[PDB]
Write a structure and sequence with these properties.
part of a larger assembly; 11 chains; A mainly alpha; B alpha+beta; C alpha+beta; D alpha+beta; E alpha+beta; F alpha+beta; G alpha+beta; H mainly alpha; B: alpha+beta; four-stranded antiparallel β-sheet; globular; E: alpha+beta; motor protein; dynein; microtubule; cilia
């Protein structure tokens, strides 16, 4: 759907079908799994390919490659990372504990820090940050 | 400061009544008109003619493309410079 | 001896879809240029 | 006879620089005189018929009392020129193809 | 970067499948029978479609539908796993659906 | 309008011609032409149609007893059937 | 009085290839009439 | 050059590269000396 | 980059010692804070993606 | 109400026709049509019936001595027999 | 050859398939299939049957416990029952 995903898809398809056959055969796939540490049976890999092989080829190709990347990616951009930053640990409640931020500044051992930021990002002027004013912080 | 100077030169000659730039789908940005009840007319009528003409030219021998187009009516000369980003219109009676 | 029991029927007609396209010499030329380009990519 | 006059007009137009072609096509998209072979002829006749009726409907829609006597599309190779004369009992959008590169 | 129609026709002999939902043996048999049809009768294309769908009529399916041509457009309703759209000879193109 | 071959009731042949001509008048591209000619007739009469629009195309197709129409307008060709 | 089938449809096969734009079945492209048609459109003043 | 080929390459480095992640620790030794080295010349 | 290329708690610990190590290399020589926040948020996102995957 | 073939008493046919049509109108799915057309007509007369609904099927059936019905109504096909 | 729902003996479901499929290839319309199979299947296994064949079907029917087949064969599905 995008244009750099085609770039990474071509690079990974190059990585898998490493000999140059133009088709993912089972041996190169097991080579990739064994480089990742896994050595499963020779009957489960058959079922895995048979679900991914649509053409009846017993070998999957670039159209099928991007079909599986498409379904797994877009079925499940900046909402998630800024969201789950701290407020996404609270899940639509708008009240962040100060003790979480004290713990974060505790573990990473930072030399000098004063928490006046949370004092001066206070937009409800209560002592916590809702999510819209949390993005206003970011 | 070169694009707007060319707009100001081209809109002040002896017959020019309007310059229009329109995007791919639509959104006529940087018109030149004192009211906007007929800009949208141009913006949604003309690029159909521009890409239809690119179909007519390119169909013949596909190394070929379209660059410009002119339609001279009785009282108007609609010149359209179509290309990939946008469509551009200049209207002028001679 | 034996009794009576009853069942139903779920018939699936084969799945269908709609496809629309326009063939013209420009389309054909562009695709062949692409098929050729991937040939060079495979070769290189 | 006026048939000599119209053929003479073909050599008048065609004697100009770079003029590759002249053809006349009526409102039913069928060419009458040619200068090309037969299939480039029929594809011009169909394409230009449809394109020019769309362009005339565009100009008439845009302004009620204004019609067109002129049409000029451009290539990087050859500047097709369409002229129409929309009337009753005759509407013969003649179309020239030319370019100033040659000769 | 060839510089006419003719060098394009020199290169373009491949028969690329534009889009297709067919089994691989399905695809190879249908693809080869269509190339043999197109090479057999370049001039009269009506009886190319005669041969293509009557072979597919006796062998594969009772309903079939073949369209060969030069420039056209289409919108069809087709039952899935049985659609072939290929470019043959760098110009002629064939839609094929059941 | 020009019709070269048809075997179907003329009372909806008029339906076919008035469906196609306003379509050809309205839109300015030839995919949406074959879209509309099926679509609106599909919501009129039957569940199934197929429709081709272009120039210089070849076809073999199984007919339908009273649904097979081969238009011709202005060097632009239409086919449709069930 | 005891058997049934639905109202069965009937289907044979028909062909079509499009070539050219003469008015009606008055004229045919694979003949000579094209010449005489262009003739009766060639001599009008 | 001496004051802005350094300080536009010191800001061009990439510390962490691509368990075994202890190699990263070893890797992050090396470039450390890099920045230290570069900084000294600018100082 | 660490955001681009993020028993689980061993891995999360190792990632966070690696971030500590980036700051330690800084020691030998405020956006500090926000970088550190988006890093930890992304790591927790990894963990909850996993936790929904086992379902 | 188009009835092609039967050998059976006629007021029960009346019950057949209306218990087919209002069953068709009340329901909206393919299976439940013949579900109702049995179940009601079942509990009215006799414990044993068998009923079929759809298009483009086919069966011979042995002749039931007095209870056999076939419909054809609005592109819906229905069979009933004992 | 695919079967979906059944409780008969395996030997007679094999008998049912080898009775049905070559009979399907022998004929071309499908009223007479559902006469021929049921007459044969009377004379072979047991003295009373009913069969349906076809496409796009729905039904609700009473099967004695050891007698029910739902073929799905050539996309012309058969269901047969005591």
């Amino acid at each position: 759907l995008t244009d750099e995903e085609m770039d990474m898809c071509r690079k990974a398809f190059a990585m898998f079908d490493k000999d140059g056959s133009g088709t993912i055969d089972t041996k190169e796939l097991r080579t990739a799994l064994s480089a990742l540490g896994q050595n499963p049976t020779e009957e489960d890999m058959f079922v895995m390919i048979s679900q991914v092989d649509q053409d009846g080829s017993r070998c999957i190709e670039f159209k099928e490659f991007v079909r599986v990347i498409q379904i797994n990616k877009q079925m499940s951009a900046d909402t998630l990372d800024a969201f789950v930053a701290l407020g996404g640990n609270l899940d639509k409640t708008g009240r962040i504990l100060v003790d979480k931020l004290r713990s974060i500044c505790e573990e990473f051992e930072l030399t000098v820090n004063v928490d006046r930021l949370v004092k001066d990002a206070d937009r409800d002027l209560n002592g916590f940050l809702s999510y819209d004013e949390f993005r206003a912080l970011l | 400061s070169d694009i707007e100077s060319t707009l100001t030169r081209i809109q002040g000659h002896k017959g020019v009544i309007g310059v229009i730039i329109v995007n791919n789908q639509g959104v006529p940005l940087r018109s030149t008109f004192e009211h906007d009840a007929m800009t949208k007319q141009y913006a949604d009528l003309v690029p159909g003619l521009a890409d239809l003409a690119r179909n007519l030219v390119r169909d013949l021998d596909p190394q070929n493309d379209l660059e410009f187009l002119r339609i001279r009516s009785h009282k108007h000369e609609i010149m359209v410079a179509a290309k990939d980003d946008f469509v551009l219109l200049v209207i002028q009676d001679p | 001896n034996y009794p009576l029991r009853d069942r139903e029927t779920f018939t699936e007609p084969p799945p269908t879809a709609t496809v629309s396209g326009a063939c013209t010499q420009w389309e054909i030329y562009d695709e062949y240029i692409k098929d050729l380009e991937r040939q060079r990519i495979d070769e290189a | 006879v006026d048939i000599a006059a119209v053929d003479e007009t073909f050599k008048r137009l065609q004697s100009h620089k770079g003029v590759l072609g002249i053809i006349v096509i009526n409102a039913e998209g069928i060419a009458i005189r040619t200068t090309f072979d037969n299939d480039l002829t029929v594809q011009y006749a169909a394409l230009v018929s449809h394109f020019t009726v769309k362009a005339r409907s565009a100009v008439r829609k845009l302004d009620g009392d204004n019609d067109l006597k002129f049409l000029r599309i451009r290539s990087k190779k050859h500047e097709i020129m369409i002229a129409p004369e929309f009337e009753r009992s005759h509407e013969y959008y003649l179309v020239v193809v030319q370019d100033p590169s040659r000769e | 970067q060839f510089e006419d129609m003719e060098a394009f026709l020199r290169v373009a002999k491949y028969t690329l499948v534009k889009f297709t939902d067919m089994h691989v043996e399905m695809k190879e048999e249908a693809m080869d029978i269509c190339i043999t049809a197109v090479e057999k009768y370049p001039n009269d294309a009506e009886k190319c479609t005669q041969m293509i769908k009557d072979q597919m009529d006796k062998k594969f399916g009772a309903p079939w539908h073949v369209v060969v041509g030069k420039g056209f457009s289409y919108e069809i309703t087709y039952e899935v796993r049985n659609l072939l759209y290929i470019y043959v000879g760098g110009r002629t193109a064939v839609l094929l659906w059941k | 309008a020009v019709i070269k071959n048809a075997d179907m009731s003329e009372e909806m042949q008029a339906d076919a011609v008035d469906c196609a001509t306003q379509a050809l008048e309205k839109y300015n591209i030839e995919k949406d032409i074959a879209a509309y000619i099926k679509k609106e007739f599909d919501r009129k009469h039957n569940p199934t149609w197929h429709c081709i629009v272009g120039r210089n195309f070849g076809s073999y197709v199984t007919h339908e007893t009273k649904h097979f129409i081969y238009f011709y307008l202005g060097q632009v060709a239409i086919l449709l059937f069930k | 009085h005891e058997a049934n089938t639905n109202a069965v449809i009937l289907v044979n096969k028909a062909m079509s290839h499009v070539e050219g734009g003469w008015p009606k079945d008055v004229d045919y492209t694979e003949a000579e009439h094209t010449i005489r048609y262009r003739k009766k459109v060639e001599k009008d003043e | 050059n001496r004051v802005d080929s350094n300080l536009g390459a010191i800001s061009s480095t990439l510390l962490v590269e691509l368990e075994g992640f202890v190699e990263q620790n070893r890797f992050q030794k090396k470039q450390a000396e890099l920045l230290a080295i570069r900084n000294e010349e600018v100082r | 980059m660490k955001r681009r290329l993020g028993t689980l708690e061993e891995i999360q610990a190792a990632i966070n010692q690696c971030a500590k190590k980036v700051l330690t290399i800084s020691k030998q020589l405020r956006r500090w804070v926000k970088a550190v926040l988006r890093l930890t948020g992304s790591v927790e996102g990894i963990k909850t993606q996993v936790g929904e995957y086992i379902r």
